[PDB]
Amino acid sequence: HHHMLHLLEQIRAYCETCWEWQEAHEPGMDQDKNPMPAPVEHQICPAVCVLMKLSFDEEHRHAMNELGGLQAIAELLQVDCEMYGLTNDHYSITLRRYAGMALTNLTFGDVANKATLCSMKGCMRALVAQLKSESEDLQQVIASVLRNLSWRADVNSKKTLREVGSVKALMECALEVKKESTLKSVLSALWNLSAHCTENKADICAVDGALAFLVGTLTYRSQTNTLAIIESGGGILRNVSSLIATNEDHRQILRENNCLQTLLQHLKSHSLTIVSNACGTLWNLSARNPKDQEALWDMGAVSMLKNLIHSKHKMIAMGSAAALRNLMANRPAKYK
Numbered sequence: 001h002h003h004m005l006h007l008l009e010q011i012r013a014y015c016e017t018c019w020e021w022q023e024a025h026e027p028g029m030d031q032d033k034n035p036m037p038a039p040v041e042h043q044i045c046p047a048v049c050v051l052m053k054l055s056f057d058e059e060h061r062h063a064m065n066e067l068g069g070l071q072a073i074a075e076l077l078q079v080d081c082e083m084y085g086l087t088n089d090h091y092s093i094t095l096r097r098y099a100g101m102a103l104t105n106l107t108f109g110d111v112a113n114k115a116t117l118c119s120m121k122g123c124m125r126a127l128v129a130q131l132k133s134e135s136e137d138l139q140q141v142i143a144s145v146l147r148n149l150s151w152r153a154d155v156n157s158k159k160t161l162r163e164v165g166s167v168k169a170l171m172e173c174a175l176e177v178k179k180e181s182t183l184k185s186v187l188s189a190l191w192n193l194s195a196h197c198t199e200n201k202a203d204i205c206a207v208d209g210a211l212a213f214l215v216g217t218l219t220y221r222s223q224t225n226t227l228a229i230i231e232s233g234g235g236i237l238r239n240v241s242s243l244i245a246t247n248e249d250h251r252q253i254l255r256e257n258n259c260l261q262t263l264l265q266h267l268k269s270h271s272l273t274i275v276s277n278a279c280g281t282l283w284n285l286s287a288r289n290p291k292d293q294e295a296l297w298d299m300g301a302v303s304m305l306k307n308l309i310h311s312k313h314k315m316i317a318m319g320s321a322a323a324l325r326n327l328m329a330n331r332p333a334k335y336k
């Protein structure tokens with residue numbers, strides 16, 4: 001494909017045109033100029049649309065990757081977000097979605113492309129900023145990129161995702177999403193990010209309404225007849241519960257929203273992920289806290305956890321047994 005070289009040259013030429021204008025319109029050089037290049041007048045959206053389509057095939061990605069395809073599409077997305085900010089211009093939205101879909105495809109299963117995209121810091125900052133965009137379609141695409149970047153990432157990529165504030169932005173985004181399709185991609189990204197380190201977990205917990213929102217995902221009613229939202233929301237909660245266990249205020253938010261009760265209902269789910277997530281959360285919340293220990297005893301948790309210790313699923317067996325052990329080791333005074 002020399003068609004691919006031609007498409008990339010088109011995008012680089014346009015970016016070159018934009019970096020000329022931008023270098024004469026930095027924040028300090030504060031008086032503006034009316035001729036700012038518009039991508040509509042360089043036929044840009046069709047170019048990235050073709051690259052996006054071809055990025056679905058691995059054979060075409062090997063080609064793109066030799067030719068600098070990831071760098072060019074990222075720069076394009078960066079430069080348009082920098083130039084026009086959070087616009088509702090349908091052309092600029094569409095351009096961003098297609099570029100974002102291409103980057104989702106080019107990050108898929110490619111640890112170097114993930115690091116390269118992460119190393120492009122201005123692009124990352126622009127990606128993160130787009131979670132505020134009023135297009136939920138754009139939000140879903142951006143969440144899908146941050147998801148792929150956060151799965152099986154190297155140390156620098158994980159560091160970068162943290163530094164640019166992707167965790168907080170995603171959690172705040174999740175609170176406003178209407179569509180189940182956007183929420184699915186936002187929570188997948190968060191579930192990936194929540195496993196990386198303790199600071200990501202703490203940043204999720206530190207957003208106002210986030211913990212209550214996460215407890216709410218445990219009883220989400222899917223229109224699309226899937227359990228993805230309960231699974232991913234319950235997964236995030238499980239990962240952050242290690243820190244919640246140490247924070248009486250955060251436990252109280254969980255109590256406010258009947259968390260423990262719902263988690264015990266989850267123990268009798270047929271979804272293995274739901275059961276495993278609940279075992280894991282209950283493992284953490286059953287430790288170090290007489291109030292929650294007593295509530296679990298009162299709500300029949302001991303017997304419910306005992307029914308899962310012989311599970312063939314290993315995380316359920318381990319999780320249920322460790323939670324059971326925490327309750328047996330700390331009987332309340334009214335028990336003997």
Ligand SMILES: CSc1nccc(C(=O)N[C@@H](CCC(=O)O)C(=O)N[C@@H](Cc2ccc3ccccc3c2)C(=O)N[C@@H](CC(C)C)C(=O)N[C@@H]2C[C@H]2c2ccccc2)n1
Pocket residue numbers: 055056101102104105106107108109110140141144147148151152188192
């Ligand atoms: C290993 S299972 C799993 N569990 C939790 C999280 C993830 C995860 O983040 N997986 C990503 C990255 C994998 C990797 O880098 O090795 C992933 O698999 N992404 C896929 C979509 C996908 C598939 C399966 C699962 C399972 C569980 C959770 C999440 C996902 C996500 C991906 O990006 N695929 C692209 C197509 C390939 C052929 C390249 C893709 O979806 N491209 C579409 C153009 C993008 C798009 C974006 C938004 C809206 C419309 C279209 N894994």
